[PDB]
C-alpha cells in the first residue's frame, strides 16, 4: 500500500507548471543570498540535487549558513506541544528571496523620509481621510430594484 519514502506523495507538489518547464535561469544563479536573509523554500523539480523534503516546500525561514552550492535555512516546524527550529540543507536553486518584510521595510523608510522632511521644514503630505464618514450623496442615475417576471423564465433552461 502507501509507502513512506523521501518523495512519497509528491506527484503534484514536485511538478512544473503547464508550459513552464525547464531548468533554472541566470537570475536564480546571480541571486545573492546572505546569512540572516529571509528565504522561501520552494523545490525546483527540474534540479533534483539539494532538493528539500516535501514538508519544507512553501515555508519561509532565515538563512544561517551559506556554502558554495548550498544554503542552510532555519524553518519552524511544530512537533507535539512545541515548535522546533529545523536546519535544512538545500541547493541555492530551491531558495528564493522572501518578501515577507517588504511592507515593514517600506514603513520604516517612509518614516525616515517623513522625519527628514519634518526636520528640514518641508511641507508634509496631506493625511488621507476615512471613507466611513457621513456625507451627502447626489445621485446621477436612480433605478428601481425589483424582481421581474422575465427573471424567473431566464433561469429555466431547455
Amino acid at each position: 500500500v502507501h509507502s513512506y519514502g523521501y518523495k512519497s506523495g509528491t506527484r503534484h507538489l514536485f511538478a512544473k507548471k503547464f508550459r513552464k518547464h525547464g531548468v533554472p535561469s541566470v537570475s536564480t544563479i546571480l541571486t545573492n543570498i546572505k546569512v540572516g536573509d529571509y528565504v522561501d523554500v520552494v523545490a525546483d523539480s527540474a534540479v533534483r540535487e539539494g532538493m528539500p523534503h516535501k514538508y519544507y516546500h512553501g515555508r519561509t525561514g532565515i538563512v544561517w549558513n551559506v556554502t558554495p552550492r548550498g544554503v542552510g535555512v532555519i524553518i519552524n516546524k511544530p512537533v507535539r506541544t512545541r515548535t522546533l527550529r529545523k536546519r535544512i540543507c538545500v541547493r541555492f536553486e530551491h531558495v528564493r528571496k522572501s518578501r515577507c518584510q517588504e511592507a515593514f521595510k517600506a514603513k520604516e523608510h517612509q518614516f525616515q523620509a517623513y522625519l527628514a522632511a519634518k526636520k528640514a521644514g518641508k511641507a508634509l503630505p496631506p493625511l488621507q481621510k476615512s471613507s466611513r464618514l457621513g456625507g451627502i450623496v447626489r445621485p446621477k442615475n436612480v433605478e428601481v430594484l425589483a424582481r421581474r417576471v422575465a427573471d424567473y423564465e431566464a433561469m429555466v433552461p431547455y
Partner: protein, 298 residues
Amino acid sequence: FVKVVKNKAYFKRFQVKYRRRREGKTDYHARRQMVLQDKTKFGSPKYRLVVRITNKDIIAQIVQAKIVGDEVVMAAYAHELPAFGIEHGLTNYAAAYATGLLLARRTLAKLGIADKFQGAKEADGSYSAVRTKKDDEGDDEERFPFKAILDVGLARTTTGARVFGVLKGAVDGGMAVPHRPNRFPGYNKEKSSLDAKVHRDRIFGKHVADYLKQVKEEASSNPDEKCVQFSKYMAAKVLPESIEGMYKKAHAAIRADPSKSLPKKAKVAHKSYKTKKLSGAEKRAAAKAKVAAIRERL
C-alpha cells in the same frame, strides 16, 4: 489525406524555447556554468572573455553578468586593426591574436593596472601557467593579474582555432585567462607537447604568406584564368615577405597606444525608415470592405 501534426492543440501546448535558443545564439547550459560562481563569494565580479567571429570581423569583449543584462567592460574589434597597420586578413589567426592583444591592453589601461602587468612583449608562441587565486604556485605575495574566463559560444573548440588565437593574444597582453596549450596550433596530442615555433609562425601569419606566395605562382602560370583568392592582397601589392614584419609593427603599435581606433568623421537628425503599423480600427475597416465587396459580387 494525412494527419495534421501542427493543429490547434499542438500550438496551445507548445512551449517556446528561450529567445536566444530559438535564434541559435546562446548555449544556455554552458552559459549557466560560466556565470555561476561560489555562493560564498556573494556576487563578487567575474568576467567572461567573450570571443565571437563573424564572416568579416572578430569581436572580443570583457563581459560581466547582471540580472538586468550583461555589461561590456571593454570591447575590441578586428576592423579597428587598420588603425594599427593591419589592412588585410582581418579574420585570420594573426588578426585574432592582435585583437586579443588589443582587448587586453585596453582593459588593463581602463583598470589602471597597465604598466604593471605587461605580459609577453615578444610573442614566442609558448605556454605558461596563468597566475590565479585558485593556484597559489607557492602563495607568493605578488599582485594577481586581472582574470577573465574564455567564452567561445557555439564555436567548435578544435586545435588551432582562431578563438584560441584571441585567447593567446589576451594572455600575452597581460590578462590571466585559465587555459592549457592543448588547443594551440602546433600542439601534438600524441606527444602531449607544444611546438612553440609552429604557434609563433601562425601568430605572425607565415601560413598566410606561404599560401599567398603559392597562389601568386599559380596566378602567374595561368593569367587567362580569373583569380579571386587573395584578390585584394594582389591589388594592394602585399608581398609575402612583409607580412611577418607588418604584424610585428602592429603588436608594437597596439602596445604603444591601445585606445586608438578608426578615425571618426566630425559629426543631424535621424531619418525614419520604419513602415507604420496599421491600427486595429483600420484593420477592421479593411476587413469589412473586403467582406462588403464579396457581398456586392455575390
